[PDB]
């Protein structure tokens, strides 16, 4: 209710998502190779696809954030930090990026 | 001059045109445009240079 | 008093002209610096007060 | 006899006492503005 | 004072308006009629930032912050504690900016030049003035200005950027960007040229318009010439202020989606096979 | 009105020049192939004349397309050899660094490793033809003012690619081949470290490179104001004033209170462009080497501004009066 | 390294006031070395200013000038001055325009002053002159735009002044610098140069119009038909640029 | 006293230029200054005292 | 003393103008620092004193 | 003997007692504009 | 002592004006530190003391 | 001993100018490096040792 | 020895202001990292013994 009552009394029924649809639109599957010849973190970067957001940002952002409780948080939060490994990098910004775009 | 410029004029009117054209049929502003650019490039350019 | 030698050291034609455009400027300045506030701004009030 | 603008004494003296007056003309306005505001609305 | 060749330049005549009521020089620079208003509105602008600035309670230039009126104003007058401060220096940037390339018309005038100078900075000031007037009108609001600061007007450009999800892909700011790099990489090889014909290694005779000439030719396989580059340099630079100009007055008033949303045209062809 | 030198009113062609000679021999490497385009004759000069291949140029051009190539087929092969899908997708497709996974060590070819092979060649491309320009100089008896200019440019290259990733002990912190990628890494960039605006060298590298536009736009309508007094002839003009050199320097006098020379004006043209990517090099090696985060270094060296208002809609509007309901 | 030296004094705060040190000693470099010409600064008088500014003179540079013109040292003596200018003061003080005593366009002062180049040809690499009339250059022709050659020329006030005859060329550079102009017997006497950033070339005439049809006869000349000086390009563009503010009382006055 | 000299070394149509814009700076100014005053606007106080 | 000899080092002219110039702008500054606190800013006592 | 002005000794000595007379003149004014502000709110 | 011959060396006219800027600039910054810290700004003691 | 023969090799005019800015920022820098610290900040000390 | 001659290569104007900026510059890096120290920050050192 903090998020569907939060201004006003709106709630969810079930139009909110069909609209008159068997099925409802703008759902989301894993399109996780987006790349054929590639593995890592450029077979989920390097393509226009439809959860890219008409970007080259990552694909996979939905799958990863939304399903799979991966961590959103990239920055720093002091002046300096000593930069240990296992610390988000500018490819985790990037993926965070792209799911932000579809926010 | 004189020539090449009229030439290069004609590329511009027919660019209009392909862009009006391709607008009617279908497509869109933007992808009329585009080859409606493209149009008054080659056309134009063409026609500027295969006669003088 | 004797002010009048202002005009032996400025031209007059060019002092003319120069102070034209100051005071149409400065008048076109503070008409609308009346229309921006709301008490006096005529054409608003002509409005409210037509019911 | 120092003259950077080549006015003699005499023409800098003159000049002197009209630019003096209308200094004091215009001072004189300018304390007859400031004594009616400061009735309208003091600042002290 | 004077220069060693100045004397026989300094000649009555070749003003816009004003005749020889304003025709002279105060120290180096020149007072014209538009030098009188220039020197008004400047200073007019100056102090009223920092009677802004001794309200805002700092005096720190990095800190001090005069904010256009809330879009709630629209495009009326604002109080002047609430934003109407900024309306008035913005007047009188405006007149200061006119001023300026009014006097600079009058100055080439008097030495029997070209007037290409104010028309260059003339793109300069449509350049501010598509972002403090010309984009706020067609945007309804006064307030879609950016701020009066060092770094305040930075995070305007920030967030106005990021208004748009990603302003990279804009395609007239991919335009303009293209026209800062360049007019730098050729303002540093013009220069170098003109440096290295001029200096020569210690014990060497001074190189001339040949040898520049026939450098790049050996190094690019094309040389522009020594008119062409200077003719090309402002066209960049002067295309560089333009298409800066168009990509901040189609964001927003023409485009109000994300930019990336924009190259959909090119991916949705209908030529391009599904 | 007054003719502007803005387009030549007629064009005189004659035989092409080859360019001057000394006893270093240059003509033997040229390839005295000339040819004349009248297009671009009307704001420069119309002979595109032979070419000096040398060593460095012919080692850079195999070599820089190489990495054209490795990064260009990498890309084919990833929209699976369809032509049309290459096209399409063209800006988009990319050849991605390493994952950060595998630190400063090579990395499988798929996942990076055609990356470094790919970007040890454009290394040694940029490198090749920095040396062809600094022999060059050297074999015209010139200064080595473009060498130098150059040497600036790859500062920020090295420091963007090489240099900061070796310091952070990762390859994964090089920069993607990719048209729209790179503008990608770039946003990011900033936003992963704070705020880049805050950076002080990036705001230094700003002021240098609008003051190069800035300059150059000053630099270049000076010049063709002056051109009726012979101006665009800078050489001659500082081996003997002439009066186009002093109306220029008059112009500027009367209007900024100072002025430069015919020379002196090329030494402002070239610092300018220089410092840009010196400053911006030393802005970015600094960047995750030792703040990490800029926004939060403006805070705690007080050059931050503050707001007072209030940050959500709510606080200026409805969401029915913006609607209109 | 994440440590900072003192307070909040990191690396990255140091290397900031490095480059504030070395950017004040490049201010100080570069504005000195746009000093080598025109100083000391002198007054109106022509004595030397008691004000010379914050930046002294620069150290003397040379420059070793191309075939056998000798040395030159910028710091020093000016050979490009002027003397028995014909120009008076209209004040007393300081900081006030010069009035031309006599002719100004003849006098060659203001828009129309020249300046006291050398008196010799510039040259190409070769040493040969760089300017010369396409009638001495073997294999140059007019190969785009309208060729100038044999059209009327048109003055600043409409009179027709005469016919272009020739047409000067910097074949280094394959780019047209002079017109040469045949002045009619009713408005002059033989050729004159006028260089090609002053005339508008259209399909039927060329038209001048910095000069009027009674100034075409005062146009400095050239000692030989087959080259021009420096100093005399110097006076020949001097005399038509000064013609955009003297040609007649209208465009001297204000426009407004 | 004997500051009438001071037109000895300042030419009178240079300095009253000097003067001319600044003394209508300081009345431009200072009249701006107490607009923005919630106290001395007297366009405000107007619309106020109106009740 | 001998003070007088500095007319000798500056030119009297410059001087003047670079005075002028430096007093309006110190006069300026500590006007404008007075106003920006709150205890030596008589606008705001003005507004406070009326209540 | 010594003058990068071209004044003389006498000029200078002139002009500096006028000088210094307007010194004092607008310094007597800011020691009674001071002196008022004091009463007014004084500082220490 | 013999210090009278940096004269010699130094212009008299070019470092007036350098230690005249120099005096001043410092004199602003050691007037600026003292507001910074709030134990000598005699602005916000005057605020106290009032009460 | 004999290192008066420096000045045969460095220009004084160069070094003084130099040295003159030298050993003002330096002594800044120390200064201000002083009021970093807590322990040696004597503006904050007084401070402290006024209450 | 007979290192005398290197001032044959070198010459005595540009190698002095060389070798007293790098002598400045060497000294007060060595300063600034002894007072990123802990153990060797005098400062902080002398505030611990009060
Ligand atoms: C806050 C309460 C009052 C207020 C309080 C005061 C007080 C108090 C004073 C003023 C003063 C003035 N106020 Mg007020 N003022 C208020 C609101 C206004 C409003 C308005 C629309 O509301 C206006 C228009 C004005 C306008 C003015 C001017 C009359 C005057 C300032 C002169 C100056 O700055 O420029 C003058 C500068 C000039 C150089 C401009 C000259 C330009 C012209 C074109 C020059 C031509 C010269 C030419 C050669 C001819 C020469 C001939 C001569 C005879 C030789 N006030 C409010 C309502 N105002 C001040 C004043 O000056 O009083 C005399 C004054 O003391
Ligand atoms: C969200 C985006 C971030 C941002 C992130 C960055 C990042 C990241 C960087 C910059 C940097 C720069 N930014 Mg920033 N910046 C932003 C906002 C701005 C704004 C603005 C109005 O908002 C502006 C004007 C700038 C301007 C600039 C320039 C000052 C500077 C680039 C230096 C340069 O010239 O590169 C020119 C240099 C190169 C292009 C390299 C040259 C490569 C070699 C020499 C050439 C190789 C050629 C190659 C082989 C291809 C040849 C093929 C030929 C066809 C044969 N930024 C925001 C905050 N900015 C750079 C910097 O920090 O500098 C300190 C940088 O790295
Ligand atoms: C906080 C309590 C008081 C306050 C306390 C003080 C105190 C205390 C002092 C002032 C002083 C001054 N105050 Mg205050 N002041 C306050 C509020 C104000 C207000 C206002 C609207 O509220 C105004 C207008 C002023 C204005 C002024 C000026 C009269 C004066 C500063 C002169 C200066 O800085 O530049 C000086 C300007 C110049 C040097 C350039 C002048 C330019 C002219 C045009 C040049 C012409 C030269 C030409 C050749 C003709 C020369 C002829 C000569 C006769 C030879 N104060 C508040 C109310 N104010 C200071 C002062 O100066 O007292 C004398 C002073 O000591
Ligand atoms: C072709 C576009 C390029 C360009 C060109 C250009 N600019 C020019 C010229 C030209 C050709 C000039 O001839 C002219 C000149 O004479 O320069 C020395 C000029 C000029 N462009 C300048 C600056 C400038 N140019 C910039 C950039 C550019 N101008 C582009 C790169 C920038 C940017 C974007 O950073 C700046 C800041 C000046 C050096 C000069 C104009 C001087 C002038 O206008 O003087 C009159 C005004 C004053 C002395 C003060 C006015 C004060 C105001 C009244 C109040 C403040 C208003 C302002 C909005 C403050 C905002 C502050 C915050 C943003 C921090
Ligand atoms: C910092 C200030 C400016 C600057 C300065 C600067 N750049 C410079 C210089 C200077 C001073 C040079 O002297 C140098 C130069 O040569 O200029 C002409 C250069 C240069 N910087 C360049 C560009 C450049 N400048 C940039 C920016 C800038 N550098 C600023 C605008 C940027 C950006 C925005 O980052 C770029 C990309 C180059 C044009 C040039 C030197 C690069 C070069 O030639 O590298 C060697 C590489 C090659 C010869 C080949 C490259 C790859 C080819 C595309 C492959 C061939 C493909 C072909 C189709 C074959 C296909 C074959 C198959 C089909 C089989
Ligand atoms: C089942 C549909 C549902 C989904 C899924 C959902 N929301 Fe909502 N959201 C709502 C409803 C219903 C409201 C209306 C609440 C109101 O404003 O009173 C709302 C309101 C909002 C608000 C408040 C807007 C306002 O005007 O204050 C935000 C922002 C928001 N959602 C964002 C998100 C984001 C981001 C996501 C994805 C993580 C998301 N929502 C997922 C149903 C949902
Ligand atoms: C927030 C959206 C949400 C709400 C609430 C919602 N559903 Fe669904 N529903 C889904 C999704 C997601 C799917 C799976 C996608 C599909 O099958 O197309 C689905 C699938 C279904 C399908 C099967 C579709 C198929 O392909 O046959 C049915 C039946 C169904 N929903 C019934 C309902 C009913 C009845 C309600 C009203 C109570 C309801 N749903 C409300 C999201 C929701
Ligand atoms: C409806 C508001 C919403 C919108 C739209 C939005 N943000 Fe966010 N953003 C969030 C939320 C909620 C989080 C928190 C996620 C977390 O901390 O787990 C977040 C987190 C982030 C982060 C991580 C910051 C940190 O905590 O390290 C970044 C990066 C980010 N946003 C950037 C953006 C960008 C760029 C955009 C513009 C495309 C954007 N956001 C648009 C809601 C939004
Ligand atoms: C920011 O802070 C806040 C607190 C907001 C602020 O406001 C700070 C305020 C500050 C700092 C006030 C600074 C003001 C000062 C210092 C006041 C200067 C004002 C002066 C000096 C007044 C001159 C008057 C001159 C006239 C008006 C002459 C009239 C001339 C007439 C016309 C005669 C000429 C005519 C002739 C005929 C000449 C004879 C000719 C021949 C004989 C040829
Ligand atoms: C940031 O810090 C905070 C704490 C905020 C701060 O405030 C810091 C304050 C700081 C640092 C104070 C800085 C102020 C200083 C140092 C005060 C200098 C002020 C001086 C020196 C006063 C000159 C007065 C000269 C006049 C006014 C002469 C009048 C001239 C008359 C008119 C004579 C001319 C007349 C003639 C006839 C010509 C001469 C004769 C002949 C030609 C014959
Ligand atoms: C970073 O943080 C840490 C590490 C904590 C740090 O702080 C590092 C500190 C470091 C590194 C200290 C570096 C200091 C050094 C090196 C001290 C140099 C200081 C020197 C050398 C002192 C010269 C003084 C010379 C004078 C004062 C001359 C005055 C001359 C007078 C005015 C006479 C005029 C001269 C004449 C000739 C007269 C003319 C005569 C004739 C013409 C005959
Ligand atoms: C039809 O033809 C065929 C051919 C088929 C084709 O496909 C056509 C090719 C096509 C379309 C490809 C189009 C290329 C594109 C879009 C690429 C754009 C490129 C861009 C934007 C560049 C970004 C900036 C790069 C930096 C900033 C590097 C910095 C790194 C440098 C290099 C430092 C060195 C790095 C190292 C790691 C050192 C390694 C060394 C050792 C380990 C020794
Ligand atoms: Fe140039």
């Known amino acids: 209710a903090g998020h569907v009552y939060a201004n006003a009394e709106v709630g969810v029924t079930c139009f909110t998502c069909h609209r ?84 | 001059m004189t020539c090449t410029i009229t030439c290069w004029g004609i590329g ?18 933007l992808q009329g445009a585009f080859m409606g650019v493209l149009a008054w490039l080659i056309v134009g350019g063409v026609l500027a240079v295969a006669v003088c | 008093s004797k002010f009048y030698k202002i005009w032996l050291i400025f031209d007059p034609r060019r002092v003319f002209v120069a102070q034209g455009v100051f005071l149409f400027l400065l008048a076109a300045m503070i008409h609308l610096v009346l229309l921006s506030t709301e008490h006096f701004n005529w054409f608003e009030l002509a409005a409210a007060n037509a019911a | ?40 609305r003091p600042w002290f | 004072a004077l220069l060693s060749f100045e004397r026989k330049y300094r000649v009555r005549g070749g003003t816009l308006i004003g005749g020889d009521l304003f025709d002279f020089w105060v120290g180096p620079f020149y007072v014209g009629f538009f030098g009188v208003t220039t020197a008004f509105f400047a ?28 879009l709630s104003y629209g495009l009326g007058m604002a109080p002047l504690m609430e934003g109407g401060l900024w309306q008035i220096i913005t007047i009188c940037a405006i007149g200061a900016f006119v001023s300026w390339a009014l006097r600079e018309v009058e100055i080439c005038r008097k030495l029997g030049m070209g007037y290409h100078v104010p028309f260059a900075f003339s793109v300069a000031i449509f350049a501010y003035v598509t972002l403090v007037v010309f984009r706020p009108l067609l945007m309804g609001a006064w307030g879609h200005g950016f701020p009066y600061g060092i770094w305040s007007h930075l995070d305007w450009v920030s967030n106005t950027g990021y208004a748009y999800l990603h302003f990279h892909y804009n395609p007239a700011h991919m335009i303009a960007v293209t026209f800062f790099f360049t007019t730098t990489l050729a303002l540093a090889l013009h220069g170098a040229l003109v440096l290295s014909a001029a200096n020569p290694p210690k014990g060497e005779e001074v190189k001339g318009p040949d040898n520049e000439d026939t450098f790049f030719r050996d190094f690019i396989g094309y040389s522009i010439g020594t008119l062409g580059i200077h003719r090309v340099g402002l066209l960049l630079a002067l295309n560089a202020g333009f298409w800066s100009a168009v990509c901040i007055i189609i964001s927003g008033p023409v485009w109000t989606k994300g930019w990336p949303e924009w190259w959909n045209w090119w991916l949705e062809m209908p030529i391009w096979p599904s | 009105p007054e003719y502007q030198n803005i387009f030549t009113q007629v064009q005189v062609q004659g035989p092409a020049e080859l ?29 595109l004349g032979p070419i000096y291949l040398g060593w460095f140029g012919i080692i850079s051009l195999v070599t820089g397309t190489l990495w054209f190539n490795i990064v260009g087929f990498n890309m084919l092969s990833q929209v699976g050899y369809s032509i049309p899908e290459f096209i399409r997708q063209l800006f988009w497709l990319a050849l991605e660094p390493p994952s950060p996974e595998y630190g400063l060590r090579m990395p499988p070819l798929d996942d990076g490793g055609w990356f470094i092979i790919a970007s040890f060649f454009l290394l040694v491309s940029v490198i090749s033809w920095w040396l062809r320009s600094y022999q060059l100089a050297e074999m015209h008896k010139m200064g080595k003012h473009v060498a130098w200019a150059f040497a600036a440019a790859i ?27 790179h503008l990608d890494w770039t946003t990011a960039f900033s936003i992963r470290y704070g705020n880049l605006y805050y950076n002080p060298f990036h705001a230094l590298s700003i002021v240098f490179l609008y003051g190069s536009v800035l300059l150059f736009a000053m630099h270049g309508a000076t010049i063709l104001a002056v051109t009726r007094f012979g101006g665009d002839r800078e050489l001659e003009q500082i081996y003997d004033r002439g009066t186009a050199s002093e109306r220029a320097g008059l112009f500027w006098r009367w209007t900024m209170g100072f002025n430069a020379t015919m020379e002196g004006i090329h030494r402002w043209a070239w610092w300018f462009a220089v410092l840009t990517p010196i400053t911006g090099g030393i802005g970015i090696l600094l960047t995750g080497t030792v703040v990490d985060n800029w926004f939060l270094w403006a805070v705690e060296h007080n050059f931050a501004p503050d707001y ?7 606080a200026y509007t409805t969401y029915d009066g913006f609607l209109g309901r | 390294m994440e440590e900072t030296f003192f307070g909040n004094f990191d690396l990255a705060s140091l290397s900031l006031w490095l480059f504030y040190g070395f950017f004040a000693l490049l201010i100080y470099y570069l504005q000195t070395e746009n000093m080598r010409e025109g100083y000391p600064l002198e007054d109106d008088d022509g004595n ?27 710091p020093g003596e000016d050979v490009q001055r002027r003397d028995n200018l014909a120009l008076r003061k209209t004040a007393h003080g300081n900081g006030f325009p010069m009035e031309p005593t006599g002719d100004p366009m003849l006098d060659g002062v203001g828009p129309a002053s020249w300046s006291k180049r050398r008196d010799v040809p510039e040259l190409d690499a070769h040493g040969h002159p760089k300017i010369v009339p396409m009638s001495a250059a073997e294999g140059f022709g007019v190969s785009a735009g309208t060729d100038p050659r044999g059209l009327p020329v048109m003055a600043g006030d409409g009179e027709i002044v005469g016919l272009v005859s020739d047409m000067w060329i910097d074949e280094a550079e394959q780019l047209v610098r002079y017109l040469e102009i045949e002045l009619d017997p009713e408005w002059g006497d033989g050729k004159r140069l006028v260089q090609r950033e002053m005339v508008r070339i259209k399909s039927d005439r060329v038209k001048v119009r910095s000069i009027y049809g009674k100034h075409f006869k005062n146009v400095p000349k050239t000692k030989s038909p087959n080259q021009v000086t420096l100093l005399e390009e110097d006076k020949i563009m001097a005399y038509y640029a000064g013609g955009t503010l003297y040609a007649d009382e209208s465009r001297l006055e204000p426009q407004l």
Do not use: C
């Open chain 5, 43 to 70: 200073l007019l602008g100056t102090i009223l930032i920092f009677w802004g600035a001794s309200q805002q309670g700092t005096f720190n230039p990095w800190l001090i912050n005069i904010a256009p009126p809330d």
């Open chain 6, 19 to 47: 360019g001057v000679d000394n006893e270093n021999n240059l003509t033997e490497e040229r390839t005295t192939g000339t040819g004349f385009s009248q297009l671009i004759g009307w704001i420069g000069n119309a002979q």
């Open chain 2, 12 to 29: 511009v009117l027919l660019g209009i045109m392909t862009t009006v054209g391709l607008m009617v049929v279908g497509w869109s502003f």
């Open chain 4, 1 to 40: 006899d120092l003259s950077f603008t080549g006015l003699t004494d005499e023409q800098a003296q003159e000049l002197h006492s009209v630019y003096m007056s209308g200094l004091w003309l215009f001072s004189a306005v300018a304390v007859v503005a400031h004594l009616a505001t400061f009735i309208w």
């Open chain 6, 308 to 314: 007072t208002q209030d940050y959500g809609y709510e």
């Open chain 6, 155 to 181: 500062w920020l290259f090295l420091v963007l690619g090489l240099f900061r990733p070796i310091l952070m002990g990762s390859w994964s912190e090089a920069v993607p081949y990719g048209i729209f990628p």
């Open chain 1, 20 to 103: 008159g649809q068997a099925v409802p639109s703008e759902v989301w599957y894993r399109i996780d190779p987006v790349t054929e010849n590639t593995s890592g973190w450029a077979s989920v970067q390097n393509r226009a696809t439809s959860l890219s957001q008409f970007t080259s940002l990552p694909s996979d952002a939905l799958y990863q954030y939304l399903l799979n409780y991966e961590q959103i948080a990239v920055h720093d939060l002091e002046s300096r930090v000593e930069t240990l490994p296992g610390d988000p990098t500018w490819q985790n910004t990037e993926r965070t990026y792209s799911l932000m775009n579809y926010f």
């Open chain 7, 48 to 74: 030397t200013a008691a004000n010379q500014g914050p930046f002294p003179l620069p150290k003397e540079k040379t420059f070793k000038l191309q075939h056998g013109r000798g040395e030159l040292t910028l």
